[PDB]
Amino acid sequence: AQEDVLAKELEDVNKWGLHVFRIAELSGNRPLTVIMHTIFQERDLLKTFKIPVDTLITYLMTLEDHYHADVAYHNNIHAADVVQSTHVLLSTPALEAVFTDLEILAAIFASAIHDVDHPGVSNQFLINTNSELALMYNDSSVLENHHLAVGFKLLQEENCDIFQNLTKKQRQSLRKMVIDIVLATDMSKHMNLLADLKTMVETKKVTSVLLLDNYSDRIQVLQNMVHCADLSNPTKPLQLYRQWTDRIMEEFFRQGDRERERGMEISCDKHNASVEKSQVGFIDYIVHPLWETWADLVHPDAQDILDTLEDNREWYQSTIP
Amino acid sequence: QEDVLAKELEDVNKWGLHVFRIAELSGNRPLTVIMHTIFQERDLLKTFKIPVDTLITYLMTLEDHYHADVAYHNNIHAADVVQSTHVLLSTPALEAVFTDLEILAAIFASAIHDVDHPGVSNQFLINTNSELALMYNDSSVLENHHLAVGFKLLQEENCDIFQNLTKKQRQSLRKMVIDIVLATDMSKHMNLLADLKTMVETKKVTSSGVLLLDNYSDRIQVLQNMVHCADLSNPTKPLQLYRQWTDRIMEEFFRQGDRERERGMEISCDKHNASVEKSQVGFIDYIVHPLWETWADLVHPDAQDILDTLEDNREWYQSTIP
Ligand SMILES: COc1cccc(Nc2cc(-c3ccccc3)nc3c2C(=O)NCC3)c1
Ligand SMILES: COc1cccc(Nc2cc(-c3ccccc3)nc3c2C(=O)NCC3)c1
Ligand SMILES: [Mg+2]
Ligand SMILES: [Mg+2]
Ligand SMILES: [Zn+2]
Ligand SMILES: [Zn+2]
């Protein structure tokens, strides 16, 4: 009966605002595994790429295992939500028959692994406390390089190589794209990514659907697409959004509590925080400029997402005065 | 022995230092003694309040992480790049341009720039599905690892030569060292060269022809090209040095070839099928000379003696071709 309700909730996999937190309770805490299996079935990705079903389950569970169950925001539920959101953006009418099967595979895999083994703390925290991770990666996209190293490394585990039947050319190319996509999720790169997206909207070329052309534009589109999915919480129905905020504030406060345990200045402070004002500014300066520009690329496919974000923005603002 | 090395070292400020003899007479400690002399000379120990024993401890531990069994990418190559940078930092046209901190980073970077090199290329490591390429997502694989090793060794007991620096000082130098080492990757050559060409066209300079570099972007860029130049300086040294570096890179390459043929890899590096001579002319013409000429255009006329040797060696190597 739980499998019954689980399978019912999975009927909404193609819809913005899927009940991701319920799917997580109903799956026995395997949102990423169940959401990823259902998406591969939907898009016929097992057959196309000859992925044995048992290998795909075995990898998915191992990766899911490598998201930390004690990090409030950057955990497996978030990875799941990011995969399903890229899945929906990939389906936009303005991009129909634009991306190859291998590019579709790259974007969804990249979404799955994009935050794996996330410690619940910022790049800057890891730089300033002189941690193994920052020493390893020379202070440069430290977390995102790690996510990638981990997401690939897990393919080598027993019965875990989901790409065993791709050609060597397919695999080299998929690898390069996954790396390019996942490094583009570092927020220190947001302003530069959005510049390029604006330029592409401004020089946009369309059919009587979107034309590309060359690897450089296609990759930028995929990079911006997964960044949008990554920052999609404030575009979701408000009950989903509000839970996403409580979780990121918890993680943010746990980090400030560790910076205090150290005599570090506090970036994060649970006796200073102004949650509602911070969310309004997040949307106004970061989240709305990205989604406005994305909506422009795919006009008018994303109008309802954009209307949703604007409503949520107003709601949060309304809590202030 | 301690007398001969004393005297050989008195040439530390000269292009064409007898670096192989120094390695010999120091008991394979050329990076320790060359770095040590340099810090004394430049007065880097008083300026940065470095206890003598800490530098020595670090330098020895740093040098031990160069592989003795790799024919080019070892501690003699790291002693050599260090010394070559130290001389280029003394270019008339760069007089009083860089701070004591920036001089320190250039020279620290030089020293660590190849540490723990396996004697094989980034493309090898990407093709052998290596663990280092897995870790660094195929980007500047070697170069990222050299840095992470260099900095980690400072945390060993009595190896933190930076202990008496302030916190802003440590951040800044850490940043500079990384930008400088990442620039040693040859994949980045052409892009750095174009940028240096840009700087020369639109260059500034006082009435002594001393260059004026205000912002970080321009100064780091110069220190990047300066250490890249030092790395690629072997063809510009006296012939009896150049030849010795060339035999050594050719051995390292032919050994990578062996490691390949073996593993069933397509052999890249091929000893039963290379012209050492023609490959050197090729290398000078397409990479080393466009580089040191452009550098020469920046500090005109100061790099003249250097560019002249480079062109006299190209001529000699081309004379070895029937
Ligand atoms: C892509 O990398 C990263 C890294 C850290 C946080 C995020 N996301 C957020 C940040 C913030 C936030 C909070 C206070 C000040 C500034 C920003 N608020 C939210 C999210 C989110 O996506 N969901 C819920 C609302 C994304
Ligand atoms: C900085 O990165 C790297 C990597 C590999 C070789 C080098 N340097 C050389 C390469 C080659 C060479 C020879 C044949 C074909 C292509 C290149 N010859 C020489 C050096 C050198 O610097 N000293 C001795 C002469 C530099
Ligand atoms: Mg992330
Ligand atoms: Mg190197
Ligand atoms: Zn994320
Ligand atoms: Zn080198």
Side-chain angles (χ1 to χ4, degrees):
Chain A
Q2 177 166 328
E3 312 176 288
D4 293 347
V5 186
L6 167 53
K8 155 158 211 201
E9 292 288 359
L10 283 176
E11 282 179 42
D12 284 13
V13 77
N14 293 332
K15 293 148 182 82
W16 209 251
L18 161 84
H19 301 305
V20 74
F21 289 101
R22 301 163 175 197
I23 278 159
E25 301 167 25
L26 283 168
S27 76
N29 177 53
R30 300 293 203 173
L32 178 54
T33 297
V34 314
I35 287 152
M36 282 276 282
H37 184 213
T38 305
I39 289 180
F40 278 54
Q41 304 198 302
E42 189 80 3
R43 302 191 166 268
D44 210 7
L45 288 175
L46 294 167
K47 284 264 151 195
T48 304
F49 292 113
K50 295 185 304 162
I51 315 173
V53 62
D54 88 307
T55 312
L56 171 65
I57 303 296
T58 306
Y59 181 77
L60 295 168
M61 297 197 309
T62 302
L63 173 78
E64 192 160 20
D65 278 354
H66 278 85
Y67 279 91
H68 303 198
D70 60 357
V71 169
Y73 180 95
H74 286 105
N75 60 49
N76 63 310
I77 310 202
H78 174 63
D81 170 56
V82 169
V83 163
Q84 184 266 343
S85 308
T86 295
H87 165 65
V88 165
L89 298 175
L90 281 158
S91 285
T92 209
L95 309 177
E96 199 190 322
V98 168
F99 294 110
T100 71
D101 295 326
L102 193 68
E103 303 161 329
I104 287 149
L105 183 68
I108 311 185
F109 183 74
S111 303
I113 72 151
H114 88 279
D115 265 339
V116 58
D117 207 34
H118 204 299
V121 307
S122 68
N123 274 333
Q124 202 67 76
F125 178 94
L126 290 167
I127 293 162
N128 305 344
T129 52
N130 313 300
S131 51
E132 281 308 306
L133 284 172
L135 273 143
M136 191 66 82
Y137 289 117
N138 312 303
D139 296 346
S140 281
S141 300
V142 164
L143 284 159
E144 290 76 25
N145 268 298
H146 180 66
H147 302 324
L148 281 160
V150 169
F152 296 119
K153 176 74 203 168
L154 296 177
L155 290 168
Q156 307 174 352
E157 292 270 303
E158 178 165 18
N159 198 21
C160 279
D161 192 18
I162 59 151
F163 311 116
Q164 63 190 260
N165 287 322
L166 266 59
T167 65
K168 301 162 287 204
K169 203 165 147 202
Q170 275 170 342
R171 287 168 58 105
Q172 185 186 59
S173 169
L174 182 134
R175 177 158 167 85
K176 167 163 203 89
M177 293 188 284
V178 164
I179 288 155
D180 282 359
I181 291 184
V182 171
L183 294 177
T185 66
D186 178 357
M187 281 309 290
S188 65
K189 322 212 104 180
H190 155 84
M191 284 300 177
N192 292 347
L193 260 206
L194 182 66
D196 294 16
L197 191 56
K198 280 172 163 164
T199 302
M200 173 174 321
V201 167
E202 262 298 299
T203 56
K204 220 172 49 147
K205 284 173 146 189
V206 304
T207 62
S208 284
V209 173
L210 271 178
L211 305 173
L212 347 128
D213 188 42
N214 65 81
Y215 176 77
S216 176
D217 305 309
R218 302 170 77 90
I219 197 50
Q220 300 184 149
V221 162
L222 281 174
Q223 288 166 321
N224 276 285
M225 175 180 295
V226 169
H227 181 59
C228 280
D230 200 31
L231 298 177
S232 67
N233 294 167
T235 88
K236 298 311 179 44
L238 181 64
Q239 86 286 359
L240 285 167
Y241 181 23
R242 283 200 64 190
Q243 255 282 285
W244 286 123
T245 310
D246 298 339
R247 298 172 168 253
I248 195 57
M249 303 310 307
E250 168 72 1
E251 224 179 270
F252 285 172
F253 304 144
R254 292 193 200 173
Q255 179 174 313
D257 276 1
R258 295 168 52 166
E259 301 172 340
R260 202 185 271 96
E261 281 157 39
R262 294 184 177 253
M264 299 173 61
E265 183 224 324
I266 289 184
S267 317
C268 274
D269 192 302
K270 69 206 164 162
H271 304 294
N272 273 353
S274 187
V275 180
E276 303 74 14
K277 282 161 54 145
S278 294
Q279 278 315 303
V280 174
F282 174 46
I283 293 164
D284 285 340
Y285 286 73
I286 291 307
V287 182
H288 200 267
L290 174 68
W291 271 98
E292 199 172 33
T293 312
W294 185 261
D296 285 338
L297 185 73
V298 307
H299 198 276
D301 302 356
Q303 191 74 64
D304 300 343
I305 292 184
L306 198 60
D307 293 343
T308 311
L309 175 68
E310 291 180 358
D311 291 357
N312 292 339
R313 187 272 183 197
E314 295 298 304
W315 185 84
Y316 262 106
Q317 183 50 38
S318 89
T319 62
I320 306 171
Chain B
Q1 189 156 313
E2 294 162 42
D3 270 326
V4 174
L5 179 65
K7 184 168 190 57
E8 294 291 341
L9 283 165
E10 297 171 6
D11 285 350
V12 66
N13 314 325
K14 305 193 146 177
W15 212 251
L17 187 64
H18 297 157
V19 65
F20 292 110
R21 293 153 77 158
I22 287 142
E24 258 157 22
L25 307 156
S26 55
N28 212 26
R29 292 304 176 166
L31 179 84
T32 296
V33 305
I34 293 193
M35 273 288 267
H36 190 211
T37 305
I38 282 170
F39 273 68
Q40 291 186 346
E41 179 81 351
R42 286 198 172 261
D43 201 19
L44 285 178
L45 287 116
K46 196 181 164 200
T47 306
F48 289 105
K49 288 176 170 144
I50 311 175
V52 77
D53 56 326
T54 312
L55 171 74
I56 302 317
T57 310
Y58 180 74
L59 292 167
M60 281 182 71
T61 318
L62 178 65
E63 185 156 27
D64 292 339
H65 282 86
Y66 283 93
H67 294 209
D69 75 330
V70 157
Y72 184 98
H73 285 109
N74 60 45
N75 59 318
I76 323 168
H77 168 55
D80 184 48
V81 175
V82 159
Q83 188 258 336
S84 299
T85 300
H86 158 66
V87 175
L88 298 180
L89 273 151
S90 279
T91 315
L94 294 172
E95 181 168 61
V97 166
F98 304 107
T99 81
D100 301 312
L101 198 69
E102 295 173 325
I103 281 154
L104 186 69
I107 295 166
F108 182 76
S110 295
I112 71 149
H113 91 282
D114 275 337
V115 66
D116 206 30
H117 208 291
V120 300
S121 67
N122 282 324
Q123 200 69 73
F124 184 90
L125 307 163
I126 295 157
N127 302 338
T128 47
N129 309 296
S130 70
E131 287 307 301
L132 276 173
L134 221 193
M135 183 83 83
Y136 289 108
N137 299 303
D138 299 348
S139 79
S140 285
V141 172
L142 286 173
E143 297 73 27
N144 274 295
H145 173 69
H146 309 313
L147 285 152
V149 177
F151 283 115
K152 175 67 167 199
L153 295 160
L154 292 158
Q155 297 159 35
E156 318 287 312
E157 174 66 27
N158 205 48
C159 288
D160 195 20
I161 73 171
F162 306 129
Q163 48 196 56
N164 298 335
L165 276 64
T166 77
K167 191 177 177 180
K168 190 176 150 183
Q169 278 186 313
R170 303 161 61 112
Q171 277 153 20
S172 175
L173 184 160
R174 182 181 168 81
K175 169 170 218 85
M176 293 188 296
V177 171
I178 286 154
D179 288 333
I180 289 162
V181 178
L182 286 201
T184 66
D185 185 347
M186 280 303 296
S187 75
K188 298 219 176 39
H189 169 65
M190 294 289 183
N191 284 353
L192 266 188
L193 191 40
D195 283 348
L196 186 67
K197 275 157 157 143
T198 298
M199 166 162 303
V200 167
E201 298 171 315
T202 78
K203 131 186 82 145
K204 289 204 251 210
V205 325
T206 75
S207 92
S208 312
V210 171
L211 260 176
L212 308 165
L213 302 158
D214 196 55
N215 54 49
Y216 183 74
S217 162
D218 282 346
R219 310 161 75 81
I220 192 54
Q221 182 182 9
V222 167
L223 295 162
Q224 290 168 323
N225 281 287
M226 176 178 307
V227 164
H228 176 52
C229 282
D231 206 15
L232 298 183
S233 54
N234 300 158
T236 78
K237 304 277 166 73
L239 197 62
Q240 299 308 318
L241 291 163
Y242 181 15
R243 291 175 72 175
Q244 286 202 74
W245 288 119
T246 299
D247 286 338
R248 273 172 180 287
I249 195 60
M250 297 316 294
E251 203 198 333
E252 179 172 328
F253 274 2
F254 294 159
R255 289 155 74 162
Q256 182 172 299
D258 295 355
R259 272 175 81 176
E260 290 161 334
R261 321 200 181 202
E262 207 133 63
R263 296 157 152 276
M265 291 178 64
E266 214 209 322
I267 316 150
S268 313
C269 294
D270 188 18
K271 74 191 158 192
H272 309 310
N273 280 287
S275 190
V276 174
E277 292 78 37
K278 297 176 179 165
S279 286
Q280 277 316 299
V281 178
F283 181 55
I284 281 159
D285 287 354
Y286 295 95
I287 299 159
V288 182
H289 194 285
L291 189 64
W292 272 97
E293 186 149 62
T294 295
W295 180 267
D297 288 356
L298 197 77
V299 302
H300 194 271
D302 294 339
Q304 199 62 70
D305 278 1
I306 295 167
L307 198 61
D308 292 325
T309 304
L310 175 54
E311 293 173 9
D312 295 343
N313 290 339
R314 191 263 198 203
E315 184 176 52
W316 182 89
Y317 262 103
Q318 173 83 26
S319 80
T320 67
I321 301 164

